[PDB]
Amino acid sequence: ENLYFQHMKHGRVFIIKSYSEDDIHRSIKYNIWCSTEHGNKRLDAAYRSMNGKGPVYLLFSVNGSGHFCGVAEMKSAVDYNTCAGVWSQDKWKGRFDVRWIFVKDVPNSQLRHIRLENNENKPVTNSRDTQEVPLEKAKQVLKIIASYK
């Protein structure tokens, strides 16, 4: 048995959908991310309301790739006035620190059966960028990712 994730009681978990393999490479290399304006606001609000009582997890997936590519923890609030042009979209506004804790490809077929009640019961694999995941579903996702081979 593995009951690690079933036991966590605090934590908030978001899907990260990126169009760009380059942005994923840069994130892993430098432990930073940037989302859209509204994505940054959602993530910033979740980070600031957490108050270190629990982690904000990011489940990264490249749009159209058919798989998740890893997991990171948010490690700062969003700084919105930062160097422009560092991401694929040259206008992207801001930066927050992350810490990647898991880098590997998990096929969508391993996760498609988990559905999200806050997103019309759609498969978690059909989420848009910064879709939040209910903690009870997130536990199931994290277990599958951590145990995939």
Binding segment for Cl ion (CB under 5 A), chosen from 5-13, 35-43, 72-80, 112-120, is 35-43
Q: Which is nearer to Cl ion, 35 or 125 (CB)?
A: 35
Assess 36 for contact with Cl ion (CB under 5 A): yes
CB 68 within 8 A of CB 106: yes
Tell me how far apart the alpha carbons of residues 66 and 108 are, in angstroms, rounded to a whole number. 6
Q: Which long-range contacts (CB under 8 A, 24 or more apart) does 80-84 make?
A: 80/40
Assess 20 for contact with Cl ion (CB under 5 A): no
Residue 93 neighbours by CB distance under 10 Å:
16
Q: Which is nearer to Cl ion, 21 or 37 (CB)?
A: 37
Assess 93 for contact with Cl ion (CB under 5 A): no
Assess 37 for contact with Cl ion (CB under 5 A): yes
| Binding-site ranges for Cl ion (CB under 5 A) | 36-38
